[PDB]
Scaffold this active site. Structure first.
Site, PDB file in Angstrom:
ATOM      1  N   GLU A 139      -6.557   3.397  15.408  1.00 41.78           N
ATOM      2  CA  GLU A 139      -6.030   2.158  15.980  1.00 41.78           C
ATOM      3  C   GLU A 139      -4.840   1.757  15.131  1.00 41.78           C
ATOM      4  OE1 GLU A 139      -9.698   1.473  15.059  1.00 41.78           O
ATOM      5  OE2 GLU A 139      -9.168   1.080  12.962  1.00 41.78           O
ATOM      6  N   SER A 163       4.772  -0.902  -2.199  1.00 42.56           N
ATOM      7  CA  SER A 163       4.019  -0.129  -1.215  1.00 42.56           C
ATOM      8  C   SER A 163       4.870   0.562  -0.134  1.00 42.56           C
ATOM      9  CB  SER A 163       2.949  -1.010  -0.570  1.00 42.56           C
ATOM     10  OG  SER A 163       3.485  -2.230  -0.064  1.00 42.56           O
ATOM     11  N   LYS A 187       0.714   4.474   3.096  1.00 37.91           N
ATOM     12  CA  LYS A 187      -0.231   4.881   4.137  1.00 37.91           C
ATOM     13  C   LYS A 187      -0.320   6.381   4.292  1.00 37.91           C
ATOM     14  CE  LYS A 187      -0.392   0.873   7.240  1.00 37.91           C
ATOM     15  NZ  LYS A 187       0.561  -0.032   6.635  1.00 37.91           N
TER      16      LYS A 187
END
Ligand code: NA
Ligand code: NA
Lengths: 384, 382
Positions: B104, B369, B82
């Site tokens: 969000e 990830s 991310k």
């Protein structure tokens, strides 16, 4: 064996044989082509070396003096510099034909790094940890089990680190034919202070090339936190012969030096023998290891490595202290200002570098060893 | 804005101008030398790129089929892929002259990544998070505050992600002159699915160079977990035109597809509008609640670019249960000394199944990830 008058091998006679074998194996492999190829392979592809050298521009501008760089050991696999030594020694053990690793651990952070390296290399891992320390550090105990390691609670004596050390030594006496004793800092009998320093020296070698690339010159100061002393020796060692590079180790001031709730062995301790070495220890009037405190779990070790005792003696490195409160302020400040959550251990070094930078001119350079990340510390920072 | 029949820009008229300005700025900066110099500089010095490609030798030998390589996004600063998108968009916002970031977050993972990137670049950060999620994610909320961000609980509607999304949109309508809305996956109205994919494509570009260096050939299969789909697009995209490279996306099977407690939008969803895009989402007409043991796979939709790759059959999409993902979590920890994120553990679990059915000269790259430190409390409480 000796760093001036500090170091040695203060062990029972039975350990002289395993230490002789370890020293001979280390001498043979430390510069061996194949050994170094495999070590570099694991450091690169598994641990993610090299770690970057980060210019903390916002923190620098805020303070308005010297440039602060951070050597990002927080980014190594596991989140702590300990990994570099766990890999080096685990691989050395494998090259010696050992199938088992043992270690002691207080906070559990060395326990985790040893568990990780053992899993990597297909070794059995048994970790000795005082029962009181098992109780304080339940998530690290879970991590170790998750990594395939067996955590052995030491219920004898005081149920603390010194009891775990003794059990580990006792185990190694009996099992050294197939077991390697993996010491986690620049401490212990010879050859461990030298071996651990050598396996952490990659930190300083990278940082030197990185700061020359970035700035075209060596740093004015290198600042590192000092528990047993391994992250500090790792970044210091390659600069020791660069005479104009100042070296500063930062010990845990805890609740204050006057309060007696600290772990500043160099600043406030005395010469003594423990863990098979002659160095500085916090010990009471009866020669016993006395209680130590830091907000940073990894700075609870009651002594310090002999090579630091030596560096202090010859005045090649300066040693200072930083309180819990000052380390906490730095933990928050770095998170807010650069988006890096540091380990509470490393925050001691950040704290001191922030004081120092303010006095220095804007063209000068400070490298801080950011020895780990602070994810592990979120619970206790939220509690306090 | 379209990927075949999916994507688009389903927003009220109030958002047309901000989206046009974002598209225009993105076209201007994406190939701009200085923008890319600074992006690469932060990715290198702050995030720690490139991440290594690791040969999981012991895991490979134990299963006895294909070679398993792991693209180690778990080592990026923050512990998750991310970060790559958060830095990209935050820097884009700075180059556009914005001073504030909104986002969000469901589990808090994108909120944390946004907060870190905002701290780095000296931006104000406000995070909209449903009040139910705020109560369930104490440590991520703390991380966000620690990083200087403000967490704004959303008590409207069902107090969940969909309400946070709606609040963030409402905010951006008012504040877009000085605020960037930082979307966390390959979702949302155009141009967000394209932008986020472009900022995650560094994963696949590194992995391509790394596998050619290690093995002298492209992989037979790439395996990645899919929530909204950003880590998967990041590793997939540079291989899309390499026709012999199989691409497999792994969605959250949860308690089991037949139980209904899952987040397998591609597998079981229907095509509809949600979050400003036409794609697959899980529904009852209304948004259905979803479940995964992996907090990051609890998004009810999926990116339109995956919908597209599924339809043209360029990628295959499968599912893995909570139980399978947990088995893989434990297995990777024990065998390779890497504690993976529970999200990433879905990819590992599938890769282990697939590996057994392939020959020893064939190659699988799994996108790892993130790391699993964040999931320890969950896994212990289990
Ligand atoms: Na000490
Ligand atoms: Na989904």
């Amino acid at each position: 064996m000796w760093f001036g008058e500090f170091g040695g091998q203060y062990v029972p006679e039975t350990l002289i044989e395993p230490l002789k074998e370890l020293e001979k194996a280390y001498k043979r492999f430390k510069d061996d082509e194949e050994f170094n190829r495999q070590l570099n392979y694991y450091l690169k592809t598994w641990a993610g070396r090299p770690t970057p050298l980060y210019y903390a521009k916002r923190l620098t501008e805020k303070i308005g003096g010297a440039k602060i760089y951070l050597k990002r050991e927080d980014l190594v696999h596991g989140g702590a510099h300990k990994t570099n030594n766990a890999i080096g020694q685990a691989l050395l053990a494998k090259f010696m034909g050992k199938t088992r690793l043992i270690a002691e651990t207080g906070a559990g952070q060395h326990g985790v790094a040893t568990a990780m390296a053992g899993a990597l290399l297909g070794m059995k891992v048994d970790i000795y940890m005082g029962a009181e320390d098992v109780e304080r550090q339940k998530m690290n105990v879970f991590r170790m089990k998750l990594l395939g390691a067996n955590v052995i609670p030491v219920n004898s004596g005081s149920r603390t680190l010194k009891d775990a050390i003794n059990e580990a030594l006792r185990d190694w006496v009996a099992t050294f034919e197939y077991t390697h004793y993996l010491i986690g800092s620049v401490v212990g009998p010879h050859p461990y202070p030298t071996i651990v320093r050598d396996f952490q020296s990659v930190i300083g070698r990278e940082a030197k090339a990185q700061i020359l690339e970035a700035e075209g010159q060596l740093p004015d100061v290198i600042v590192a936190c000092v528990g047993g002393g391994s992250n500090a020796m790792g970044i210091f060692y390659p600069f020791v012969n660069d005479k104009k590079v100042k070296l500063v180790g930062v010990e845990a001031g805890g609740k204050g030096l006057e309060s007696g709730k600290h772990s500043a062995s160099l600043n406030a301790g005395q010469v003594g023998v423990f863990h098979g070495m002659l160095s500085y220890f916090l010990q009471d009037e009866e020669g016993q290891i006395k209680p130590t405190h830091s907000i940073a779990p990894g700075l609870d070790y009651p002594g310090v490595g002999p090579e630091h005792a030596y560096l202090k003696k010859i005045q090649r490195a300066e040693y200072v202290t930083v309180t819990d409160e000052e380390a906490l302020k730095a933990f928050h400040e770095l998170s807010r200002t650069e988006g890096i959550i540091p380990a509470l251990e490393s925050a001691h070094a950040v704290a001191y570098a922030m004081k120092l930078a303010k006095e220095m001119s804007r063209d000068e350079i400070i490298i801080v060893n950011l020895s780990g990340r602070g994810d592990k510390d979120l619970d206790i920072v939220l509690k306090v």
